[PDB]
Symmetry: C2
Subunit: 402 residues, 2 copies
């Protein structure tokens, strides 16, 4: 088939293009992944020396870019004053007060080494306060290595009695609550399905989740590891919803291993916690001196207009691919059907073709097609739109019809 032949030609060209990534894949021991050597601003250089504009943004973790001066200088100063300090430094409280300033909902904060640990600690506190064991999750959600529900479950997930609902469907959730209301300790939900395909949550869906959690005595945990960037106080500030607990992710720690969980005092008074000097310093400098509300607003508005530009590339060529998401985070889907839950993403060869083609054009993003803008990426948007335009113009006959 022309689709198979074209993806084979592009994949052979990719493999012949990047022998050093192949050698590293061999030494570390489905085409090999790209192995990146260096980075600067919105640019990434692989081990073969090819420069790319990094649209993937490290799955929203690299919001500040690879070489921001304020963060680099903060990390250098923290390094020079000493590594592996004791369990008590000023940096932790300064950082916690900055976060609470941004998320006043988080009456008490605790730091972890990852968002996975943050969600685990939140679930632990939920089960401890309520004494209940069942946790309500949603198909396609990803809260960590042992908190994955893309398959509806994972055999590696921690042995919580997880209840699985379909995203953006409050009828099924109300029925599941009728069934397990007494046993529901927590409702863990992302304001946008990150791994599920950047499926935005309908606002009524989240408001009704809050209502139901209140009425059945379960807590509401918002996994804002990804969506916390949607405003200075995240999507929860955007919608006026107050969860019992909130979890935040790695970019809050300046690009290094960090997570945070917190909220109600009575619930969180139960509280190894993360205070690494470099992480505290980088996250603090980044939040207080770089991540201004105006900078985040510019970034998310640019992301919105830029997703519009892409979808209009699709619309003009009558090709039914779409970018879905919110603000500066989107992801390409081979179907043009409106996506409400995981069941709606119901062909990876077109996505692979797109990924390889934009790589050949110098555009870097996830093979699943997710893009997360960083502060450094109008010229980058123009180049990205022109690259997508040229690729779709050339490969138009291989894509579905709108």
């Amino acid at each position: 088939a022309e689709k198979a032949q074209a993806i084979a030609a592009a994949r052979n060209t990719f493999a012949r293009d990047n022998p050093v990534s192949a050698g590293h894949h061999e030494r570390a021991r489905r085409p090999f992944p790209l192995v990146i050597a260096q980075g600067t601003g919105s640019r990434f250089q692989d081990v073969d020396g090819h420069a790319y504009v990094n649209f993937l943004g490290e799955y929203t973790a690299g919001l500040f870019g690879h070489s921001h001066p304020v963060i680099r200088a903060a990390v250098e100063r923290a390094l020079a004053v000493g590594l592996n300090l004791s369990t008590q430094t000023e940096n932790e409280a300064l950082f916690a007060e900055a976060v609470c300033d941004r998320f006043p909902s988080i009456d008490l904060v605790r730091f972890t080494n990852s968002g996975t640990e943050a969600n685990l600690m939140a679930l632990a506190t939920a089960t401890a306060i309520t004494g209940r064991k069942t946790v309500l999750a949603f198909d396609g959600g990803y809260h960590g290595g042992l908190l994955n529900f893309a398959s509806g479950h994972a055999p590696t997930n921690a042995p919580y009695h997880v209840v699985l609902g379909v995203y953006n469907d409050v009828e099924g959730t109300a029925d599941l609550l009728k069934r397990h209301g007494h046993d529901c300790a927590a409702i863990l939900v992302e304001p946008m399905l990150g791994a599920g395909g950047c499926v935005p949550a309908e606002r009524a869906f989240l408001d009704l989740l809050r209502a139901e959690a209140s009425r059945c005595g379960a807590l509401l945990i918002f996994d804002e590891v990804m969506t916390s960037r949607l405003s200075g106080g995240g999507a929860q500030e955007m919608l006026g919803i107050s969860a019992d607990l909130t979890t935040l992710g790695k970019y809050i720690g300046g690009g290094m291993s960090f997570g945070a969980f917190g909220g109600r005092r009575d619930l969180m008074e139960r509280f190894t916690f993360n205070n690494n000097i470099l992480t505290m310093s980088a996250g603090h400098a980044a939040l207080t001196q770089i991540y201004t509300r105006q900078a985040a607003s510019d970034l998310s508005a640019s992301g919105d207009r830029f997703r519009a530009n892409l979808n209009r590339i699709a619309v003009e060529n009558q090709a039914p691919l779409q970018f879905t998401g919110l603000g500066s985070l989107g992801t390409i889907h081979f179907s043009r059907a409106p996506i409400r839950s995981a069941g709606d993403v119901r062909d990876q060869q077109l996505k692979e073709l797109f990924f390889f083609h934009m790589l050949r054009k110098g555009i870097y993003l996830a093979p699943r097609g997710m893009y997360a803008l960083s502060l450094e990426i109008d010229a980058g948007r123009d180049a990205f739109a022109e690259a997508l335009a040229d690729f779709i113009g050339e490969q138009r006959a291989l894509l579905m019809a709108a």
Copy 2:
């Protein structure tokens, strides 16, 4: 009481000594005397927020093995920083790092990196339950495997909902009975070669070999958590004892002092689907530290220094006829108010003596955990050992009438 009045006087002097740590505690209260707040560090020394310099004997609970300012590690972090933060999920550093770790622990046929030892032990347990299909996990009272993997109280309401079965440390008879009862359901036996939080209680070697025997006989895996004990040799206590675990978990110093953990072992057991750690600074710092600084010669010298030094401190106790003891292995030890031989947590059966000692040695410029833990770093030298031994000598001489009798 003379002890109560002396500890009250020492605590009042501590509070008057460190107003800045108190101010930091107050400001942190927005989100048992107050803890010391540390400002900077250099080598084996720490300077607090009030400007006092201390010899750092606690070594950050075994994590600060390299010291606070080691040059090659600093340069590795600087170079990685300049080449760029937040690189993609695939870089060369992770494989170089994994090969060095596998060199040190060739038992770890497949390795995976995590952001913490808590995450490493959790992922190891996940792999155990997945391969075996069983739900019960055998742990030991007093063990600490992470924030949600803590068993000092015999359990915690925060622990992940594994069906953990708890035995008493260094007791294979009770373990054999519990294994006879739950053998078919035991997915893993998770054990530290030394009770870290339990009070640096070394595991009897026959106890670990018999845990291996039972794991083999009933089909459970054996997870050795060497987050703390991995420093006892180039291949950890498992290399020291000739034990081959089904899984091994390693801790933060392998990642150069930053958030890092590792778990690995058998191929068939081992392995989006899971977030793995490839942080640029962590990979670079841990790699440079292991390959250029954490040599077997340096680690051997350090553990020998720890052995002779525990002898020196315990002999301060013996000469002064005081029943306090330092227990542990190599360069890791801990003070206990009793002189009774410690085999399990139940043998630690008064915290005011430890608090008095801690505050007095602080006044003398020696820093360690209020619980009394010491973990020497590569920077602490014979002079540091001499100063610590003389400090303990003077403190026990002055506070002689307040301590128990041997």
